[PDB]
Structure formats: C-alpha cells, structure tokens
Swiss-Prot record, chains A, B:
Organism from which the protein derives: Severe acute respiratory syndrome coronavirus 2 (2019-nCoV)
Function: Cleaves the C-terminus of replicase polyprotein at 11 sites. Recognizes substrates containing the core sequence [ILMVF]-Q-|-[SGACN]. Cleaves and inactivates human TRMT1, preventing tRNA guanine(26)-dimethylation of tRNAs. May cleave human NLRP1 in lung epithelial cells, thereby activating the NLRP1 inflammasome pathway. May cleave human GSDMD, triggering alternative GSDME-mediated epithelial cell death upon activation of the NLRP1 inflammasome, which may enhance the release interleukins 1B, 6, 16 and 18. Also able to bind an ADP-ribose-1''-phosphate (ADRP).
Cross-link (Glycyl lysine isopeptide (Lys-Gly) (interchain with G-Cter in ubiquitin)): K5, K90
Impact reported for P132H: In strain: Omicron/BA.1, Omicron/BA.2, Omicron/BA.2.12.1, Omicron/BA.2.75, Omicron/BA.4, Omicron/BA.5, Omicron/BQ.1.1, Omicron/XBB.1.5, Omicron/EG.5.1
Protein name, as recorded: 3C-like proteinase nsp5
Residues included from the entire protein: 3264 to 3569 of 7096
Length: 306, 306
C-alpha cells in the first residue's frame, strides 16, 4: 500500500528531447519522426520578448540559422514553419527512437507528467495538474522552455503540454503541441492576468477515496448532502462545482469502498467548514487536488506500461 | 522558478528491469551486465514467508528453475547464488542497455528515486527519503518487490535500494544491492518493529532555503538562536540533532541567500513552537524533510544528466 504523487516513466520521452539554438537563444525541442517542435520564441532575444512581431522576426531566419542537436548528433534543418505559437523544424533524419505518440489537448483538472529539460538534456520528472485557470505550478528555470508534459497509455505517449513562459506571478503557462496556448496567455513578456484559481473538487474527492483505501478514515462522518447543497459550500470555498459527470467518474471508487459519492461530499463539506484541526490525510495537512480519479485507480491496481 | 519534488529521469533504469519467476512467485529483477539481481524471497511460497530457511529452500532449486524474462525475450540462466538477501542469477547475455552504474549504500536522510515496477514493467517514478529509522514511505503493491531506488550523476546510475517487503504498519523496507537490509529488518513475514521515526532536520532547513530562493519569506523572523538551544527544541519535537557537519553542508545555500544557518534555525524553531497558523510554505502546510541540501542546489541550478 501507500500513496505517492507518481510521474510516468520518462524513458520514451527522454529519447525525443533535443536542443534548439537560434542566435543566442537555446531551448528544448521535441523530435518526433522528421520534425522538431519548439517554442517560437526561440527566435527572440530578451529585448524582442517585450513586443515581438513573430512573423517579421521569422522572416529574418533561414533553415541554417537553426542549430538542432540531439545529444552529440547535429541534425540538418531542411524546412521551418510556424504553427500558432510553435515552430516546426523539418530535419533530414527521422528520430529512430520515436515512440508511438499522439498530440492531445487536455482539460483543466487533468494531470500529466513533466520532463524538465535544459539544453536538450533531462533534469527531472514530476507530476502536475492543469489548473482550472489554465496555468501550472511547475519548476522551470531559464532554458527550460520547450520542456513537455505527457501521459503514457501502455506504449503510446500522449503529448499534451509544451512549456513557454513564467508569468510575473511565478506560475507557468504553455501550449498544446499544435501551438495553441492553454488559457488566455500570449508569448509576450508583459503583465498577464490568470483568472481566479479554484480547487478541482472531483480530484479532492478521489484523493479522499484513496485515503480511505489506505486506512485513513477519521474524516468519515455521519452526514450526507445533496449535489446542490454541496455546490453552495463549494462556491464559498472556491471549489469547482460538482456535476453528475464527476459523480459518474467516481463510481468505481464508490463501489470499491462502499462509500456513496454524496456521503464523501458530506465529509468534504465538514472538512471545508471546520478545517482539519491539526490533523493530516495521507501525510498532507491540506486537501490535495492533483490526483484524478483515474490516477487513484492506476496507483491502486498497479498498471504498467513498458 | 518554482520548486517540485522531482524524480530522476528513469530511462537508464527502465532498460534494466526484468521479470523473475520461480514457481508461483513473480517479482522484479535488475539486469546489469550478465547478472540479474532480485529479492531472495522470490523462491518462497506465500506460506514459506512465515519462517523461511532460505539455504534449504534455495537448495531445492536449480539454475533452470528460475524464469527470467526481459520484455518478451527469455534469458539463459547459467548460475545462481545468494548474497545476503539478494539472489544473483548469472545469465548468458550481458544486458546491451547496461548503463554505467555503481552499487552504493546510502545514509539515513539521503534521498533517491524509486522506479515502481510490476511483472518487470515500469509503472511510475517518485522521489523518496530513507527515514532515520531505515524505512521508506513509498507506494508498493503486491508484485512490486525488486523495484529499485537510485540516484544519477551525469551518466552513472547509483543503485541504492531494492524493495523487499511491507511491514504490517504499512511502511516499506528493503536492501542495498549487496542484499544487506537497511535497518533491523529481516525477509520474514512477522511483526517487525520500526523504531521511532524522527524528522530530518538538515533537510527541513534546506527546504526553507529553497522557499526563500523561490520568494516565500514570511517565516523569516527576526530572532536567532544557538546550536545547543536549537537542539534542545529539536529533541522535544522529535527532530534529529543538528551537527557542525550539517551546518557546513548548508554553507552554499547560506551563501546564496545571505541568511546564516543559525538564523534559519531560529525561524524553524518558532515554526515548531507556533505552527504555521493556516499559512503555507512552497504550497505545503507541513514542514517538508524529503529534500537534501544537494537536492535543493540541483533543482535551483538546473543540473542535467546525459
């Protein structure tokens, strides 16, 4: 038993990370088949980023102004194009380590693993959630841009995130691999408002189920509630409203533990209104919202990938 | 910026995980060069584990009596030996994916990444600390034994942990790769007392430095203290005593932030006596002790591997 925030094994993604240099800027790119994907602000200096005209800056560049290096292998750039906020660099060679892969646009509240990289080399791997306001709370230093987020399904890598920027507030924003930002953000160094962030209610509930499965039960009370009654308490505490779709997704956890979903919502409502009174749940003194119901089931059955 | 509990990239280790079956028991093994390492209780039935005589049970087995599978290709077992609590199964072929590697015995309070595996296939990766009482708080289901813990230094994998068992209390115990248990535990299914666990003081201070580096500063108070006075408060809250060696290890973090170590100990001592009063540090409502000073420097400096 036990419950840990677990990232996916990063091997399949490590073999796809390359270094992209344009002028003085170096960042990470993703090499799949014969295309390298990277943030388009690789073509910007630190001064361009204040107000960049990406179409005009890209026109000043040719294929040989893009230095792409995979480990110690230099790749030959034979074409370049801009798709929304990503650059696609066509190279001479197909990546021999290309895994089975998909490009996916995930929804707020879904989670993914981030392979943080610098200069095309992997630094570490951790799990993240796309917040309801479409930011993430990562660990990204200078040079991390182009680091990617992903999920793995047996042998297929679903790429869902590419890192582009840190907002002045210290949170992180990026795109899917078609180059469309999550949220209202733009790849410009300016003040950018993230909306109010809220707690992913269905994720907290799944984590309470994981706690029950692991023997933590002190928070189980003798109340229940209704969906509408819970959502009144949800909006006071900046929690996302619970829908019937979320109740349905929690069905299997309900079935395994024998605790009805609206009964778990009554325990959650008393945790929100009374706090935790110095207690902990699964080693945490806060309510955790970074596990999806599918994450909880995965960790609890021990699914493998290879 | 930002600070996350980060695991090492697991690619080099994924290529070494194999499946070891002996009779009805299946667990994970580690294939390095022409040797497969796995827990010796793979040779036990579920009933043998109550009082196993490993020498007698191993004698009933021959080289062909061990099924080693790497992905879908089977290996040729040409020798077997027991070294303390691990089995060394000599196979015909050297693992072509063998990384540069060392076997190391770590100290309490040091950290490592765990590649959780089932049936020889990787399931997930997370960072763990060896507790002062020589347990770890992992996530390990049935079939997870033989999962390994490791650190990476550029290109060399330092293997430090092999998972062997879950104690009845739900915490986890295992060996180094010479088969010597960490702590007073044995590979027998019986009640086994872990000692009192204490908090890794030097790790908490490193994490407080990481918090300051990342902009969290409210806990900086304007008192100081001495080493003996801090250790008086440390022992009341089940913290491990701080030594001069620990002060020295924190030196570079001290130098970067301009905060002397004993001033950081005064902020910690008031955090222990007053709690956090509903505040958080790096998103946590508890004091974190799973980052070593070297972990903090690595993450804040962006060191990369391979």
């Amino acid at each position: 038993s036990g419950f840990r925030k677990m990232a996916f094994p990063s091997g399949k993604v490590e073999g796809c990370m390359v270094q992209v240099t344009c002028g003085t800027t170096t960042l990470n790119g993703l090499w799949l088949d014969d295309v390298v994907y990277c943030p388009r602000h690789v073509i910007c200096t630190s001064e361009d980023m204040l107000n960049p005209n990406y179409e005009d800056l890209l026109i000043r560049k040719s294929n040989h102004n893009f230095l792409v290096q995979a480990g110690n292998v230099q790749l030959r750039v034979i074409g370049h194009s801009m798709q929304n906020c990503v650059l696609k660099l066509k190279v001479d060679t197909a990546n021999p380590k290309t895994p089975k892969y998909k490009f996916v646009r995930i929804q707020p509240g879904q989670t993914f693993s981030v392979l943080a990289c610098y200069n095309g080399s992997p630094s570490g791997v951790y799990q993240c959630a796309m917040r309801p306001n479409f930011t993430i709370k990562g660990s990204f230093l200078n040079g991390s841009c182009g680091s990617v987020g992903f999920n793995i399904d047996y042998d297929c890598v679903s790429f869902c995130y590419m890192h582009h920027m840190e907002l002045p507030t210290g949170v992180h924003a990026g795109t899917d691999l078609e180059g469309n930002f999550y949220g209202p953000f733009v790849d410009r160094q300016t003040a950018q408002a993230a909306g109010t962030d809220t707690t992913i209610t269905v994720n907290v509930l799944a984590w309470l189920y994981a706690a029950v499965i692991n023997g933590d039960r002190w928070f189980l009370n003798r109340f229940t509630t209704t969906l509408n009654d819970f959502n009144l308490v949800a909006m006071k505490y900046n929690y996302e409203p619970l829908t019937q779709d979320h109740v349905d997704i929690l069905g299997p956890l309900s079935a395994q533990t024998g605790i009805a979903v609206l009964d778990m919502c009554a325990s959650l409502k008393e945790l929100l209104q009374n706090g935790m009174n110095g207690r902990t749940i699964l080693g945490s003194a806060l309510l955790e919202d970074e596990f999806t119901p599918f994450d909880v089931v995965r960790q609890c059955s021990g699914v493998t990938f290879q």
